[PDB]
Write a sequence for this structure.
């Protein structure tokens, strides 16, 4: 798995590959790893697919019930709910989740919740087995307040390299853009990103 | 076991082989792996056969009660949600790997679900020991906008690949077609490409061949009057 | 909090009467008339859809309910009590039978389970009895067609034909004159409609009358083909049009 | 403990049980009675893990005595053996199972028949003309298979039992310090004090 | 709080009587009469259904006589729904005993168990008692044919002949008059039906108002047979005994 | 150590023309030690027959459990349980112990009293139903039984021909298994008569 | 006479505590109305802010239960909010368990079942509220389902609740007797709201300012309440013809 | 009247009669006085005997080295509440290495008493308590009522005829608050205060009970000949 | 009759008399008020000096919940403390799960549902307090008042206790004369005046004034007690207005 979320001038974009493996067998080559827990709060999942799906479903439920009572939750609140589940059940979970969301007050925000269930607010985050190979590239190429097109290129190039080196990553590069304008889904095929 | 699911124009088709095994021994040569969750929601199971049957009947039972409670026809996403939350709770100990397909007022659906509770969406799926043989066929011949006839053909061909190439699979192909605005048609033994040839010899014994010590009538009737 | 009513609310009076059961039966008496008639090849259950307001959509209120594919129920008395009993009856048919034997319960045993639930509301702590009498019609392989009445006490009786609620006394007399052991289902439906007309004041048509039958298997209502032994539900609710057709031959 | 034998003859059941109690290195006792009278005409011998044997036997004894008082009636050997089997079958799936094997020798006063039941710690019950637990059967069953007759007298049963014990004393590596022998018949239970 | 509405179902009166038990017995005195008669070669159970209708499906109807197992049956007087709760519990007790000892439950042990359950509702729990009186007809190989009765107090007693329900005073006097120890089942059948015929509050005793059962060793050889009489069979025995 | 092969034993069932047959060996052992030659593994509840192989304590427990349940069934239903219904009851009962199972291999045989149709079914220890048209096998010599049945069996055998087929299937399978044998019983079941036959076989 | 204090039967087979809970329903002296359009379901309710010290924005008897379901309540606000919180919890749980949004009629049935329990169990009192649930259901379309303290519920073409429900009900009845259809034949929800307000004005015989009303609108995939300025625009359109 | 059957019932005027009846038990109790300066806090209690053969019922209970109380009313209820205070003082020391503030102790006693006034089955406590203590903010005196009301005071009195002592303390307020660094004079003021509540009987050697806590003074109770000095 | 003997019983009117009797206990309590200002809220309460022996400024009545919410109540003081203890548990669990401090409307419903729950059963007694509370959250200032029935609304100004009618009239003048709004420092002064004016209903004994406030500019949105010079300034302003 190769996943990342990057804040930019107009908000935040989540990116992911689409490969799900059972050992060396690709059980699903068109997986959607970008998961909606609220209208403009999404997450990238890594680790046990069962665990991260279970967690995400519970979070989506919590934020739906939150919204009915208190109105739209902040991205921080969503990250807190994710963290509560991941931290308190750390012995029985294998989940690495990146939470990304857009407020109008706070704009684009990214929170990463690694294995232990700690929370880390970052300008951008990378996770999954493929992320190891792009720490160097991402650190050298990330800038704050990039444009939408620059951020799409940054994620596309980054995940391209992650896919290139990581056997557990591959397929299509999916992206979800979170801004004031709304929610936009993007997809990029191998013939596009492999020639980068 | 080889099970597949294939989406088409106006619905979805699932298929399965009919061999159930205990290690290297074939327990049943004509096993029924296509299970009904509700009239138009069917699924096929691989893994622990009792678990696939039990989890299907439990969710099927609760789906029926839910349908009666809500005065609505059951949805595939409900069966999926109930199945995955049940399986997740049991942390993989219930060894049910299912391909869940069906039609409902929302449309036609195809999902896979693993014993750990993880689910997936697709236009074509395969599960079981013969899934790699089946997926090879599906990856070679699947296209968008398949007709009903093309999907049945593709699904059964994928099962055949499992039958012939996977030792865990064999015997016959069962199919179930779920089309929007129609009754689901269950096609038991859709293909029968493994009929045993006539034996060289009849092994019917002469009467009185077996040595007998005692004979007696067994009273299966209840205590009698008078 | 905690339910601190752990004592019976139904008790024996000096005369031996169980007051709350008697009063539940009084509530049933005030209820709209419902009836059941058993034929040789089917059972019919019927009632009036007493609409509380003309702005109300009375089709959304089901007085006749499917319990199993071969068992249906109707009531007289308190509607809400009936609705929850139908929920419990549907569930108990699965939990205490179908999940054990892989088949739906026979009519008499489902009736027995419903009766047990109603009996317990008559003895358990901090509850009142159910204010309904039920008429449960059904079919099963070994008992054939049957019709049962279940009262607030939990007592149940099998009937050839009967009526409960408002005009039950007059209706039962009407049924006694008309019933014989050679009735076909269509004859029973005809008698049901005749009997029900006497207790209905206002409009008498397919929109104001609710009627269902337990009869032949309906393979068209099964929802799937391919299993020969599965032939479809015997319970079928008659449409507004189907009722009106038989009201011309009335 | 170690060797427990049983033989059902014409009119009685005979139970033979070793006297040794060994705690690892030392033989702590050489006169231990590995049996409990459950009712006037029902005797149970036992062997298995230390502590659990006596605890189980006395627990069964207490229960049968309770039944006897409540109903003013002695349960048949068959009924007692079924009760015992269920307790062991229940026990085997417990948190800590009773590691106890038993022989139940009883005289049925209704049928006027001796009855011997063999039940292991799993709750495996069999009615036998003769039985044993542990390795005792391995040494003795070939002798019992040869000499046993259903019409044997009590004295002939004891003689066949002596031959079994002699073979045990010859070929068994452990010194089980002889056996206590008890006879169950229509008159009740008695101990053969010279064996 | 809740105390205000508590009837206190399990208290003594100043005279040392249990209010609810006494009132439950009053309820049972209005139930249809049930009679049990024990003979040397079997037991008879006869019981009157309460004012019935012509539209009642009699052949599938059961309100009085119930099977507990193959050897033991009961006649019910009181609330039928209450009785079915206890009957199912008794059926389970019998099976529990059979599983445990691999022998059919002795009649008295079953009777004592049900009676103890009734007793519990009079001493603890604050619930109303079961408004039921049972006549137990049964056979075991210890005491042979046995008749018992139990009532809401949980007290039980053994009988040669006994009635419960309505008009027990009149019924018991009639039974006491004509019962003899060397009596046979066919004679007991006649006594039971004659007694009901005289004590009934109905105008006449007919087949559609009766439930009937016999427990006989009239089962081929060393075994016992229960016979729950069919409507036609009750009609025949009424003609045979000369009541209709 | 393996609970399903401590005591040993086998059961086989077959369908014929308007008849079914169910048969079992009589051995109970403690691994190598033969303990009993009268341990019958076939039981019946009304007209429905149940064979059970595996751990002997569970064999006895399940028989007592199904006698318990079919007795209550009969009291409430006012009729004897049918093979199809009983099969579901066995499956339900086994699966309720999914994570602490009875170590058994049950086999149901019988004729539906209303349809007259012959019925057989097999189960794994946790309730999965094998409803074969031809034959069902179970026990420590199930491989041997599969081999015998697959070659010896032909459909629509008359009761007295089916007896020879099932007897020879059992006997020769048992003689290739150390933990099976020590006698054998065969039930021939017709709609309203059942014949029980004890077979003569080698006692080693 | 303790049969009047708890939910047990009176000698007439009546439940007085249920009947008295119906009377508590009108304690707020507020009337509500619900009607269905082609694509929408509109609910309007009187808004009375009798104290000048109150923050009028917090005075409401319309609740957003889920994204799709709205609920107006007739009865005291404590019981109203009790029911609101429960309905929200039930709707959220439903979606989690069954993987789709809880239908309006199913929620109504669920809340009706809960109410039924209070009429049968002695330790729980009935809630003194009538709950009108509205949505545009994905299967049934525009939906009005109303629940009461007896545990009764039913679907409506249109409905009214409050002290003057009869006047509004008859007014609505007369309109649907003319049109002979089960809904307001109008494309936009704005005009369905205008219809609802107009017919409440006619039935009650009172004029309304923007602060005298409260409006909830259900469309496909969302329920929302109108602001005072949205209502003002509605009132202006009504006056201009 | 119709509203005094239990603690869960308000009267039509909004009163809780069971609580008021519990308050009445305190008025029947023997008089006890509390007063403090800026360095010390003192309890004085008139102990009551059953007869001339009996002992005099103890009135003062130590809760910690820095805190304790005197009681008036049902003595077993005081034992329950003082035990609770001991535990709470102890919890504070063990978990937080912190001496429990007297004001916080009052809040805990209030909340414990309150739960017995709003629930069915229970009853209010039938005792009044005067809690003295020396913590990080100096000397403190609290008055506890079983209604739940806890009040911080310079001085007070509860029990029968407590009004006489309370008026005296209200007069002497400006004098006794200034008695700093002189334990004996503060006790004298308390003994003189409690004397305004005596009738027919006077303070004897087994009648009088005195407690003191202060800056460098652990909570200590004086009985017997230890109080003869003050008689 | 007998409908008023048990909580949660509906009278034939549809009334819960036990709740109405709880209101009588509230009306018997001292006067407490709340004033919503431009960027916050001000709470004030009348503390009756029963005796000279009461230590001044020690028996604090106003309570903080979390760090941003103030609570004051009239009636049975212990009941109010019990409610605040629950509120503190509610606020803690909210912040634990959602990270952000509990919003004031959210907090209002938590108290509301809890108080309403004590009108559902006869095994509990209704709260004998009306609670005025509020503070600053992400959407600004909020003032609430909560009754024994569980009923609560948002307020511009709120008053309860024995002198509530007097106080309300004073609050209504402020609302009319300041449509643009009141400053936090003005509100503190006005709160002092209103309590002094409302003390006419309790004129027998003298009293002690206690004021607190949460203001975005003056206290950084945290609840603080008005102490020392600012309190004295408010007391002086109040004393000047009554003369
Ligand atoms: Cl529900
Ligand atoms: Mg896991
Ligand atoms: Mg790759
Ligand atoms: Mg062999
Ligand atoms: Mg051998
Ligand atoms: Mg209630």
């Amino acid at each position: 798995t190769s996943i990342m979320a990057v804040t930019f001038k107009d908000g935040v974009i989540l990116g992911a590959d689409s490969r799900t493996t059972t050992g060396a067998y690709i059980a699903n080559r068109v997986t959607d790893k970008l998961t909606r827990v609220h209208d403009k709060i999404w997450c990238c999942r890594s680790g046990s697919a069962a665990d991260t799906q279970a967690i995400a479903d519970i979070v989506q439920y919590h934020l739906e019930l939150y919204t009915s009572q208190y109105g739209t939750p902040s991205t921080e609140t969503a990250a807190s709910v994710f963290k509560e589940l991941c931290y308190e059940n750390k012995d029985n979970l294998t989940a690495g989740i990146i939470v990304a969301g857009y407020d109008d007050k706070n704009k684009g925000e990214v929170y990463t919740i690694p294995l232990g269930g700690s929370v880390h607010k970052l300008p951008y985050a990378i996770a999954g087995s493929g992320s190891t190979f792009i720490y160097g590239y991402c650190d050298k190429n990330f800038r704050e307040n990039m444009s939408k097109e620059e951020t799409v290129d940054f994620i596309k190039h980054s995940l391209s390299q992650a896919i290139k080196w990581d056997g557990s990553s591959g397929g299509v590069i999916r992206m979800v853009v979170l801004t004031a304008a709304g929610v936009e889904r993007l997809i990029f095929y191998p013939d596009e990103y492999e020639q980068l | 076991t080889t099970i597949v699911g294939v989406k088409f124009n106006n619905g979805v088709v699932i298929a399965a082989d009919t061999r159930s095994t205990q290690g290297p021994i074939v327990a049943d040569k004509n096993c029924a792996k296509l299970h009904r969750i509700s009239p138009k929601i069917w699924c096929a199971g691989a893994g622990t056969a009792a678990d696939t049957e039990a989890v299907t009947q439990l969710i099927g039972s609760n789906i029926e009660l839910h349908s009666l409670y809500t005065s609505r026809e059951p949805r595939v996403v409900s069966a999926l949600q109930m199945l995955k939350q049940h399986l997740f709770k049991y942390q993989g100990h219930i060894g049910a790997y299912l391909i869940v397909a069906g039609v409902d007022p929302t449309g036609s659906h195809l999902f896979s679900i693993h014993a750990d509770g993880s689910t997936d969406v697709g236009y074509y799926l395969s599960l079981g020991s013969g899934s790699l043989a089946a997926m090879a066929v599906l990856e070679s011949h699947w296209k968008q906008d398949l007709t009903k006839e093309e999907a049945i053909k593709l699904a059964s061909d994928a099962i055949q690949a499992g039958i012939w190439n996977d030792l865990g699979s064999g015997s016959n192909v069962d199919v179930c077609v779920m089309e929007i605005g129609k009754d689901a048609e269950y096609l038991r033994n859709y293909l029968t490409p493994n009929v045993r040839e006539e034996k060289q010899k009849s092994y019917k014994f002469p009467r009185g061949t077996t040595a007998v010590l005692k004979e007696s009538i067994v009273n299966i009737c209840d205590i009698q009057e008078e | 909090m905690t339910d601190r009513y752990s004592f019976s609310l139904t008790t024996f009076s000096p005369s031996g009467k169980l007051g709350q059961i008697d009063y539940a039966l009084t509530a049933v008496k005030q209820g709209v008339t419902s009836l059941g008639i058993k034929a040789t090849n089917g059972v019919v259950i019927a009632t009036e859809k007493k609409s509380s307001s003309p702005l109300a959509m009375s089709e959304t209120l089901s007085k006749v309910s499917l319990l199993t594919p071969d068992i249906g129920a109707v009531y007289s008395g308190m509607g809400p009590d009936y609705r929850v009993l139908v929920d419990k009856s549907r569930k108990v048919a699965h939990t205490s039978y179908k999940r054990i034997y892989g088949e739906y319960p026979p009519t008499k045993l489902l009736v027995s389970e419903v009766a047990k639930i109603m009996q317990e509301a008559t003895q358990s702590g901090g509850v009142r009895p159910f204010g309904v009498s039920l008429l449960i019609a059904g079919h099963d392989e070994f008992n054939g067609f049957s019709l049962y009445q279940v009262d607030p006490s939990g007592s149940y009786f099998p009937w050839k034909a009967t009526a409960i609620g408002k005009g039950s006394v007059a209706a039962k007399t009407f049924l006694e004159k008309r019933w014989n052991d050679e009735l076909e289902l269509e004859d029973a439906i005809h008698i049901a409609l005749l009997t029900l007309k006497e207790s209905v004041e206002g409009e008498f048509n397919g929109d104001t009358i609710e009627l269902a039958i337990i009869g032949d298997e309906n393979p068209d209502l099964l929802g799937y083909t391919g299993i020969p032994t599965d032939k479809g539900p015997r319970f079928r609710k008659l449409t507004s049009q189907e009722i009106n057709d038989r009201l011309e031959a009335l | 403990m170690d060797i427990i034998l049983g033989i059902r003859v014409q009119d009685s059941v005979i139970l033979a049980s070793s006297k040794a109690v060994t705690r690892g290195i030392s033989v702590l006792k050489d006169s231990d009675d590995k049996t409990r009278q459950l009712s006037p005409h029902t005797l149970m011998s036992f062997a298995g893990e230390a502590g659990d044997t006596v605890q189980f036997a006395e627990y069964i004894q207490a229960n049968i005595q309770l039944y006897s008082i409540r109903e003013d009636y002695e349960l048949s050997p068959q009924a007692v053996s079924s009760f015992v089997r269920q307790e062991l079958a229940k026990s085997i799936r417990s948190r800590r199972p009773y590691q106890v094997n038993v022989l139940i020798g009883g005289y049925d006063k209704k049928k006027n028949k001796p009855e011997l039941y063999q039940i292991d710690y799993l709750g495996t019950k069999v009615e036998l003309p003769y039985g044993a637990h542990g390795y005792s059967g391995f040494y003795t069953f070939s002798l019992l298979d040869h000499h046993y007759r259903p019409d044997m007298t009590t004295e002939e049963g004891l003689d066949l039992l002596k031959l079994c014990v002699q073979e045990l004393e010859k070929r068994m590596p452990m010194d089980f310090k002889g056996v206590i022998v008890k006879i169950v018949d229509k008159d009740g239970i008695r101990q053969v004090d010279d064996f | 709080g809740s105390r205000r509405y508590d009837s206190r179902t399990t208290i003594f009166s100043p005279e040392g009587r249990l209010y609810q038990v006494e009132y439950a017995l009053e309820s049972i005195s209005h139930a249809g009469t049930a009679i049990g008669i024990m003979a040397s070669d079997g037991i008879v159970l006869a019981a009157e259904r309460k004012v019935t209708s012509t539209l009642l499906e009699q052949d599938t109807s059961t309100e009085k006589l119930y099977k507990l197992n193959d050897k033991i049956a009961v006649a019910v007087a009181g609330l039928t729904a209450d009785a079915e709760i206890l009957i199912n519990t008794a059926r389970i007790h019998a099976q529990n005993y059979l599983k445990t000892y691999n022998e059919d439950i002795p009649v008295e042990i079953l009777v004592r168990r049900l009676s103890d359950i009734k007793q519990g509702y009079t001493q603890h729990g604050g619930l109303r008692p079961f408004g039921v009186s049972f006549i137990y007809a049964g056979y075991d190989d210890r005491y042979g044919y046995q008749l018992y009765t139990s009532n809401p107090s949980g007290n039980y007693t053994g009988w040669k002949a006994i009635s419960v329900g309505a008009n027990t005073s009149a019924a018991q006097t009639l039974l006491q008059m004509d019962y003899k120890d060397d009596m046979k089942v066919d004679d007991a059948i006649e006594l039971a039906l004659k007694t009901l015929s005289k004590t009934t509050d109905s105008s006449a005793l007919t087949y559609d108002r009766l439930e009937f059962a016999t427990i006989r060793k009239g089962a081929n050889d060393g075994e016992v047979y229960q016979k729950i009489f069919k409507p036609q069979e009750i009609k025949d025995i009424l003609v045979k005994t000369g009541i209709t | 150590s393996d609970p399903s092969s401590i005591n040993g034993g086998i059961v086989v069932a077959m369908t014929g023309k308007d008849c079914v047959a169910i048969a079992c060996d009589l051995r109970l052992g403690s691994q190598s030690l033969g303990v009993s030659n009268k341990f019958e593994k076939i039981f019946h509840y009304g007209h429905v027959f149940l064979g059970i192989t595996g751990l002997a304590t569970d064999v006895t427990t399940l028989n007592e459990m199904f006698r318990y349940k079919t007795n209550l069934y009969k009291l409430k239903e006012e009729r004897a349980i049918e093979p199809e219904t009983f099969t579901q009851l066995v499956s339900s009962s086994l699966y309720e112990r999914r994570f602490g199972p009875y170590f058994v291999g049950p086999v149901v045989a019988g004729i539906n009293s209303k349809s007259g149709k012959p019925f057989i079914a097999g189960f794994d220890l946790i309730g999965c139903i094998d409803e074969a048209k031809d034959f069902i096998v179970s026990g420590t010599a199930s491989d041997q039984l599969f081999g015998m049945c697959e070659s010896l069996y032909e459909p629509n055998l008359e009761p007295e021909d089916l007896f020879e087929t099932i007897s020879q299937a059992l006997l020769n399978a048992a003689d290739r298994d150390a933990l099976s044998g020590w006698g054998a019983v065969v039930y021939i079941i017709k709609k309203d008569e059942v014949v029980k036959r004890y077979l003569k076989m080698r006692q080693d | 006479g303790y049969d009047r204090h708890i939910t047990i039967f009176s000698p007439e087979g009546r439940l007085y505590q249920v009947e008295y809970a119906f009377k508590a329903t009108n304690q707020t002296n507020i009337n509500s109305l619900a009607v269905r359009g082609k694509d929408c379901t509109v609910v309007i309710s009187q808004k009375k802010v009798p104290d000048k010290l109150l923050d009028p924005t917090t005075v409401s008897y319309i609740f957003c239960i889920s994204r799709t379901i709205g609920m107006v309540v007739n009865g005291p606000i404590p019981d109203a909010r009790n029911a609101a919180l429960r309905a929200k919890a039930e709707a959220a749980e439903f979606r989690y368990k069954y993987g789709y949004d809880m239908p309006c009629d199913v929620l109504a049935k669920r809340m009706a079942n809960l109410s039924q329990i209070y009429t049968q169990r002695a330790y729980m009192r009935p809630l003194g509220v009538i709950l009108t649930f509205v949505s545009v259901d994905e299967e049934l379309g525009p939906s009005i389902y109303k629940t009461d303290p007896a545990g009764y519920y039913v679907g409506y073409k249109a409905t009214a609740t409050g002290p003057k429900q009869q006047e509004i009900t008859t007014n609505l009845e007369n309109h649907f007797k003319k049109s002979k259809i089960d809904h307001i034949n109008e494309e936009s929800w704005e005009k369905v709201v205008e219809f609802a307000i107009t017919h409440m004005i006619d039935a009650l015989g009172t004029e309304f300012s923007k602060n005298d009303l409260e409006v909830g609108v259900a469309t496909k995939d969302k329920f929302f309440t109108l602001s005072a300025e949205n209502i003002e625009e509605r009132l202006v359109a009504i006056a201009e013809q | 009247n119709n509203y005094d059957g239990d603690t869960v019932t308000f009267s039509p005027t909004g009163r809780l009669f069971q609580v008021e009846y519990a308050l009445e038990a305190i008025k029947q109790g023997s008089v006890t006085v509390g007063l403090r300066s800026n360095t010390h806090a003192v309890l004085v209690a008139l102990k009551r005997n059953a007869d001339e053969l009996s002992s005099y019922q103890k009135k003062i209970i130590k809760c910690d080295e820095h805190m304790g109380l005197s009681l008036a009313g049902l003595a077993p209820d005081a034992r329950v509440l003082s035990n609770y205070l001991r535990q709470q003082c102890n919890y504070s020391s063990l978990v937080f290495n912190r001496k429990l503030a007297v004001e916080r102790a009052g809040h805990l006693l209030c909340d414990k008493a309150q739960k017995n006034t709003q629930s069915y089955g229970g009853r209010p406590y039938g005792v009044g308590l005067l809690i003295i203590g020396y913590d990080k903010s100096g000397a403190h005196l609290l008055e506890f009522q079983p209604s739940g009301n806890v009040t911080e005071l310079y001085g007070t009195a509860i029990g029968a005829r407590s009004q006489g002592a309370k008026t005296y303390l209200e007069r002497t307020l400006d004098t006794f608050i200034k008695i700093d660094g002189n334990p004996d004079e503060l006790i004298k003021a308390g003994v003189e205060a409690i004397s305004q509540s005596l009738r027919d009987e006077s303070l004897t050697v087994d009648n009088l009970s005195i407690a003191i806590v202060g800056k460098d003074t652990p909570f200590t109770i004086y009985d017997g000949e230890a109080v003869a000095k003050y008689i | 009759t007998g409908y008023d003997l048990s909580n949660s019983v509906f009278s034939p009117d549809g009334r819960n008399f036990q709740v109405e009797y709880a209101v009588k206990a509230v009306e018997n309590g001292t006067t407490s008020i709340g004033i919503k200002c431009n960027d916050g809220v001000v709470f004030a309460v009348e503390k009756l000096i029963t005796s000279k022996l009461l230590v001044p400024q020690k028996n604090v009545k106003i309570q903080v919940v979390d760090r941003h919410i103030g609570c004051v109540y009239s009636g049975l003081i212990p009941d109010g403390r019990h409610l605040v203890n629950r509120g503190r548990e509610e606020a803690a669990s909210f912040k634990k799960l959602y990270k952000t401090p509990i919003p004031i409307p959210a907090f209002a419903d938590r108290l509301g549902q809890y108080v309403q729950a004590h009108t559902l059963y006869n095994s509990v007694r209704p709260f004998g307090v009306s609670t005025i509370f509020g503070g600053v959250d992400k959407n600004g200032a909020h003032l609430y008042m909560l009754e024994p029935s569980g009923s609560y609304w948002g307020y511009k100004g709120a008053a309860t206790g024995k002198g509530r009618q007097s106080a309300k009239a004073e609050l209504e003048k402020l609302v009319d004369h300041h449509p643009e709004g009141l400053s936090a420092r003005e509100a503190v002064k006005q709160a002092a005046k209103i309590i002094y004016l409302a003390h006419e209903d309790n004129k027998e004994k003298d009293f002690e004034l206690e004021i607190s406030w949460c203001s975005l500019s003056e206290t950084n949105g945290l609840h603080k007690f008005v102490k020392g010079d600012l309190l004295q300034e408010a007391i002086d302003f109040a004393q000047k207005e009554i003369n």
Q: What stands out?
A: The helical segments of chain D are 52-71, 77-91, 136-147, 154-171. The two ends of chain D are 20 Å apart (CA to CA). The pocket of chloride ion (ligand 1) is lined by residues G 110, 113 (CB under 6 Å).
